[PDB]
Design a protein around this motif. Structure first.
Motif, PDB file in Angstrom:
ATOM      1  N   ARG A   1       2.005  -6.260   0.548  1.00  0.00           N
ATOM      2  CA  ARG A   1       1.494  -5.689   1.801  1.00  0.00           C
ATOM      3  C   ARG A   1       2.148  -6.440   2.968  1.00  0.00           C
TER       4      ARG A   1
ATOM      5  N   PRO B   1       0.811  -1.229   0.000  1.00  0.00           N
ATOM      6  CA  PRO B   1       0.000   0.000   0.000  1.00  0.00           C
ATOM      7  C   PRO B   1       0.837   1.268   0.000  1.00  0.00           C
ATOM      8  N   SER B   2       0.316   2.314  -0.634  1.00  0.00           N
ATOM      9  CA  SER B   2       1.021   3.586  -0.704  1.00  0.00           C
ATOM     10  C   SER B   2       1.387   4.079   0.690  1.00  0.00           C
ATOM     11  N   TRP B   3       0.463   3.939   1.638  1.00  0.00           N
ATOM     12  CA  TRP B   3       0.722   4.388   3.005  1.00  0.00           C
ATOM     13  C   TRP B   3       1.708   3.521   3.789  1.00  0.00           C
ATOM     14  N   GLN B   4       2.137   2.398   3.212  1.00  0.00           N
ATOM     15  CA  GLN B   4       3.078   1.502   3.890  1.00  0.00           C
ATOM     16  C   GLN B   4       4.450   1.468   3.195  1.00  0.00           C
ATOM     17  N   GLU B   5       4.622   2.298   2.169  1.00  0.00           N
ATOM     18  CA  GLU B   5       5.878   2.323   1.424  1.00  0.00           C
ATOM     19  C   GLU B   5       7.090   2.858   2.171  1.00  0.00           C
ATOM     20  N   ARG B   6       6.868   3.518   3.302  1.00  0.00           N
ATOM     21  CA  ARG B   6       7.982   4.057   4.084  1.00  0.00           C
ATOM     22  C   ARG B   6       8.262   3.245   5.351  1.00  0.00           C
TER      23      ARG B   6
ATOM     24  N   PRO C   1      -3.855   4.186   7.187  1.00  0.00           N
ATOM     25  CA  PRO C   1      -3.083   5.296   6.614  1.00  0.00           C
ATOM     26  C   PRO C   1      -2.556   6.256   7.678  1.00  0.00           C
TER      27      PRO C   1
END
Ligand SMILES: [Ca+2]
Length: 357
Positions: free
Chosen positions: A248, A228-233, A304
């Motif tokens: 994920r 997920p975009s919100w888990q890329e960091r 998120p």
């Protein structure tokens, strides 16, 4: 070495749940695919803990009803553990238990019924049942994932246990696997730890791993859902399975689950100790109920937001691994997010403070 146990209030205290809030005005939905609960056990338990017993009601889905089998080692253990943990920590909330057949359709229908219920109107849904994501029919995975997406759109939080059989999730096919519904990006995946704590401090918290015989927290990298975009960091590693692959990361958060430092509960009249990630979803469901009461509006989909909050909000677990199949230590805990415990165990009061407008 010496086995121990805690009451739900002890664990909530260790994780610093916000005081003066009990979930008043909130409704927590619990999904059950088997067994049932008896009023005697619940009344005894809540009284013993000195809390006003929350209202608990049963909802029949597809003909299923509240039917305890009477065996403390059977499914009643799961159903009553869920109600007792959530109810003892959010006694002001109303608890609605949705019983459905133990089928893919029953699981889905229980979720959607709870989510759209105009009579009980739950703001939180807790799930402690699951299976390897890659053992599910793709059509079922799609339908359930969309049900979770709909819940997020409606402002309903959905939590799910990550699994009790380590990084292989009970499969012996020479591969690592993550559990579903925990793998869905719209679900708050709950992993497990071994907690050594007292009222004022946490002496030690490590990855729950008692070997093949004692169980271990689920965790890893999904082969079905993209990162997920919100888990890329969060620095999720590539899958340990040959061929690697991004996906994920599971879990999102973690809490006490080691039976060797388990929860004291009353199942079918018997006072005993139970653990597993099954206890973590209802534990955090109660936390969310308290936060919602304070905010005056439901937090709904939290993932998120959680991944962009300052790290001081969580207690980072850095020691241990969830490998119970071989000597490779896949996967291992470490600084920051990891495939055993995610962001770590939440600090209740810091989470609430960070969520205040
Ligand atoms: Ca960590």
């Amino acid at each position: 070495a010496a086995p121990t146990a805690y009451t739900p209030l002890d664990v909530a205290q260790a994780y610093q749940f916000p005081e003066g809030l009990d979930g008043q005005g909130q409704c927590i939905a619990i999904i059950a695919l088997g067994g049932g609960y008896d009023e005697t056990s619940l009344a005894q338990y809540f009284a013993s803990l000195g809390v006003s017993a929350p209202q608990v009601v049963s909802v029949s889905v597809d003909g299923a009803t509240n039917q305890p089998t009477g065996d403390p080692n059977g499914p009643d253990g799961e159903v009553e553990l869920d109600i007792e943990v959530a109810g003892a920590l959010a006694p002001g909330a109303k608890i609605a238990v949705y019983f459905a057949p133990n089928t893919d359709a029953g699981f889905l229908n229980a979720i959607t019924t709870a989510v759209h219920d105009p009579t009980h109107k739950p703001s939180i849904v807790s799930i402690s049942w699951g299976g390897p994501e890659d053992s599910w029919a793709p059509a079922s995975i799609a339908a359930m994932n969309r049900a979770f997406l709909d819940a997020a759109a409606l402002g309903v939080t959905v939590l799910a246990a990550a699994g009790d059989s380590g990084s292989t999730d009970g499969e012996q096919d020479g591969l690592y696997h993550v559990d579903f519904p925990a793998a869905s990006p719209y679900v708050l995946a709950c992993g497990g730890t071994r907690l050594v704590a007292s009222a004022g401090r946490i002496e030690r918290e490590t990855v729950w791993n008692d070997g093949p015989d004692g169980g271990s927290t689920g965790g890893g990298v999904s082969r079905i859902f993209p990162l997920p975009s919100w888990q890329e960091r969060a620095n999720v590693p590539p899958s340990a399975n040959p061929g690697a692959g991004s996906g994920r990361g599971v879990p999102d958060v973690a809490g006490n689950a080691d039976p060797a430092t388990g929860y004291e509960v009353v199942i079918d009249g018997e006072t005993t100790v139970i653990g597993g990630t099954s206890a973590v979803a209802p534990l955090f469901a109660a936390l969310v109920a308290r936060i919602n009461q304070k905010l005056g509006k439901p937090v709904g989909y939290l993932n998120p937001t959680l991944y962009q909050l300052p790290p001081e909000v969580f207690h980072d677990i850095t020691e241990g691994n969830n490998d119970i199949a071989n000597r490779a230590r896949i996967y291992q805990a470490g600084p920051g997010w990891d495939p055993c415990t995610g962001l770590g165990s939440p600090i209740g009061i810091r989470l609430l403070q960070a969520l205040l407008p």
